[PDB]
């Protein structure tokens, strides 16, 4: 019955990590879009004239 | 006319092509070069004006 009890803690913490990462590549790929932005923004104002 | 936005330098025009999966730009761009040096000046004045 350790295999039981193994069982159960095992599914119920891969389900919480399963989670965590898919917030995390929601928020990078928000950041990404972001960076995206400042990127177009620095070199289209600064080494030019908008 | 946005700097940087189609290869670097001044932009003159371009071509696409196709890709398995995408897109391909040529880009033709036009850079100066062999410069010097004179001497300049704002304004000239002549007659008091």
Known sequence: ?50 | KRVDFCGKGYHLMSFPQSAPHGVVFLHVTYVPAQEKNFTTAPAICHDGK
Request: glycine share 4%.
């Open chain 1, 1 to 50: 019955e350790a295999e039981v009890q193994i069982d159960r803690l095992i599914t119920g913490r891969l389900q919480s990590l399963q989670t965590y990462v898919t917030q995390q590549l929601i928020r990078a790929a928000e950041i990404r879009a972001s960076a995206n932005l400042a990127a177009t923004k620095m070199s289209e104002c600064v080494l030019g004239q908008s």
